[PDB]
Design a protein around this nucleic acid. Structure first.
Lengths: 106, 98, 79, 94, 94, 107, 82, 98
DNA sequence: ATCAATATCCACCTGCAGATACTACCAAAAGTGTATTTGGAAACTGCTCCATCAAAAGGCATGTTCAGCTGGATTCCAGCTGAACATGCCTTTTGATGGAGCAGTTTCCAAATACACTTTTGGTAGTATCTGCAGGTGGATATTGAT
DNA sequence: ATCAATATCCACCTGCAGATACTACCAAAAGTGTATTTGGAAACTGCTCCATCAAAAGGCATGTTCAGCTGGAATCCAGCTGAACATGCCTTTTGATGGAGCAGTTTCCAAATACACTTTTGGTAGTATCTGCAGGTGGATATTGAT
């Protein structure tokens, strides 16, 4: 017996997503393509964030992705930043930003 | 007798705290504040340590972002010194006020 | 008092992370007051979820759910 | 009692994207929240979509419209692409 | 084919609070959106409350907590009374 | 055979509310006490807004509550304003309100 | 052929809206500013409304699609079945 | 010839428009704008009239509420004349473009 | 432009908190085969209502003149807020020791679901007749602004 | 203050879009009565982890002195933006017409629920070892600021 994830060619657990859609009371029924589609959309977004967080980890001479790296990856990306606009990432800090009028007159 | 000009160290601080993520309010003092407030809704409550830490991370991130908005309102007023009215104006526009 | 336990230096460090350079003396009391309204709103809801579950211990999840319905979603503490 | 989490499937995706990069427990906890959050936002919108159209089934179509409604421009285009892809590849397999 | 609304009930309550006052259809439409909106928000809170507690049933209790979560101080205190009261009465009648 | 609403001493339809809770997929089960309680809350809220709107309709020498009256009654009430803070009532307009500094002369 | 209708949002109409908003004096650049702001607001709402329309396989945008689009944005509207 | 001083009519107008609820943008012009924007998204669309009216009620309530916040930013700047920067400051704090 | 005082950066190092890893146990979970049921696409189409066309019209937008007074620029100085200390109060680490109570397991019964009928009712379609108030009219009071 | 040009208020009132009244029909809604199923309260309680307490360590907060420099008050003035006016466009409106397309009734099978069975798995636990990097030491070098 081969798993549903393996068939759809995914890492995320298609069977779990299906089970979760059902026990969530989203609808009376849940077509079979739905947990596949959704599982892949979740994997992708995970890949997009881990890809950028990873770069951030590189740019900081580090190999281990920490909350800081996830915050920099999200706030420096226009789309991810919007999608997570009302979200607070614990121990993320903020982007280095100083209003120009506050800088020395030179 | 060395002495840095007003603003140089403050600016130096902005750069320092914007690079780090550690919480900025002392923990025990915060925990006390939290327990006191809750005591008003229900007596003899216990708090998971992770619960308190969740409140703190949420509160600081909230205050920090509010200072960003406040700072923009002071700058709007052609000032560099944030004042209560800057905070009020920011909260009023966010809909947290009027 | 406790709200007064949130010291001036800490409110200043907070402002610094928020990019603030100069701070008026009236800000410290303004802030404390704002912080208290924030925590009362969030805790009021967490405790409500706590009582509903017939517990006497506020859990991280209770807080996270409170934050989520206040539109302040928080990642990292379960949920 | 068991406590599920998306941690293992996250780590798997991590090593594909950055084979030599690790992730801290706290960062993993953040990624789990993220996956749970997007799942709920996505399922919830599919829910309403089905309701609005007097339908009792959430099909891959509702998941698609939900994704278009929820995600920003490019993130949306690609997610749709990945989505259609996995559903096609899944069908072309006994 | 049938289109339900709270019109006949809004109207009954209107004559209780203001015997000689009418309501335009446009205002009634708004009242109808209001009742639906609050109904959904209350049932939504209850729904989630139930799930957060691994409960598969939404009893008057979840409804009560939702109301405390959703309404401002004084509207909650009174809403809770009316509800508890309607449930107590209902319980002793059968 | 009385209606569940009369049993509860309510005007709002308990049978309907119980029915809507089921088709909205809020949980697998709905206890018979849920719709009773919820119908009471809806009725009370409906009563509260009609009370205030009816009064606003009197202050403007009107017999019929129109949308402007609902808006006036919600805006002028702190709590109904909080509950409907992200709501737009069509044809409601706004509350007469002019910032002080915009007024002429001094003293 | 629909072209440049954003200009249908005239200076007087923008002044009137400002008046209801409690505004006494308006700078000359506010009119173009407001047209730009309105257009972005309508693009976002219509985009969602039309998305609900297509999902239902209709060629007609209903008051409800609009009402549902508005609610997603946190702009709940009462009075149109929505 | 009689001439009201600048600002008197503007105030007369505020009291006037704050007292009424009728739509302030011309009907047909607003309808062409909606059909233009929608068309640029999907050709061959039809609109229930109430769908157009729904959007006009939402847009105007949004603009009025926006001007209120804008007016407050101007007053914060010690002005009584709103400018693009005020609208921009309000939209930024509102999180419409943070 | 020079030059002392500090901060900031960086290459290197070591210890440990916390990430990695092999083994093992196991209940819940995920896949598979079979029987039964149904949601909702299809096809045909009744019929609501959207897109158009027509026309008369006056409400209202556009464009210009003009000058009141607001915003912008500039100058000025009282005093607040930042920097730098000297001081010492209490946050912080943590080790550990009761014990609260969260969470797992077993019961078992009020309450919910399923199911078959009967009675009730809100919504709708067809006409038909009132009524609150929008909008026009005329004239008395109130507001505003020049003198 | 006096006065006159206008806006404002309201009583009086007519026309009518919209609200109110009623009989009719009826399909979905809502209630009654059983039989069947089970969610989760209730009681017992093992184990996790929260509340405490010892308690130097000393870090970080507080009180103070000093003066740099920012905020707020005052002054001047170019020209932006409001008020009023003339002109006539185009939105609004009353109203009919075709027909697109939304929506109702129905036929019907691809696909989902419902189980029962078998098999696979990811989470909980230990037990033991591995390592990315926070944190400390130097020493170079840039930044800041007085001259």
């Amino acid at each position: 017996a081969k798993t549903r994830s393996s068939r759809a060619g995914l890492q995320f657990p298609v069977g779990r997503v299906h089970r979760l859609l059902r026990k969530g009371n989203y609808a009376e029924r849940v077509g079979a393509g739905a947990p596949v589609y959704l599982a892949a959309v979740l994997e992708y977004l995970t890949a997009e964030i881990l890809e950028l967080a990873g770069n951030a980890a590189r740019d900081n001479k580090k190999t281990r992705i920490i909350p800081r790296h996830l915050q920099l990856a999200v706030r420096n990306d226009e789309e991810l930043n919007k999608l997570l606009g009302r979200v607070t990432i614990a121990q993320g800090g903020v982007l280095p930003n100083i209003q120009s009028v506050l800088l020395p007159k030179k | 007798p060395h002495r840095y000009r007003p603003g140089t160290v403050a600016l130096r601080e902005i750069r320092r705290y914007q690079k780090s993520t550690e919480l900025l309010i002392r923990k025990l003092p915060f925990q006390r504040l939290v327990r006191e407030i809750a005591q008003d809704f229900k007596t003899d409550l216990r708090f998971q340590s992770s619960a308190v830490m969740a409140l703190q991370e949420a509160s600081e991130a909230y205050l920090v972002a509010l200072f960003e908005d406040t700072n923009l309102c002071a700058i709007h007023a052609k000032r560099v010194t944030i004042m209560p009215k800057d905070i009020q104006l920011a909260r009023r526009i966010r809909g947290e006020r009027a | 008092d406790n709200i007064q336990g949130i010291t001036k230096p800490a409110i200043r460090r907070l402002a610094r992370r928020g990019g603030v350079k100069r701070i008026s003396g009236l800000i410290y009391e303004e802030t404390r007051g704002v912080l208290k309204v924030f925590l009362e709103n969030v805790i009021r809801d967490a405790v409500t979820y706590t009582e509903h579950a017939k517990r006497k211990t506020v859990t991280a999840m209770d807080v996270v759910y409170a934050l989520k319905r206040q539109g302040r979603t928080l990642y990292g503490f379960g949920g | 009692t068991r406590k599920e989490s998306y941690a293992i499937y996250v780590y798997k995706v991590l090593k594909q994207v950055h084979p030599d990069t690790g992730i801290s427990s706290k960062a993993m906890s953040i990624m789990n929240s993220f996956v749970n959050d997007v799942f709920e936002r996505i399922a919830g919108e599919a829910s309403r979509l089905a309701h609005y159209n007097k339908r009792s089934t959430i099909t891959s179509r509702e998941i698609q419209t939900a994704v278009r409604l929820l995600l920003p421009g490019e993130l949306a285009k690609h997610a749709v692409s990945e989505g259609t892809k996995a559903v096609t590849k899944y069908t072309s397999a006994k």
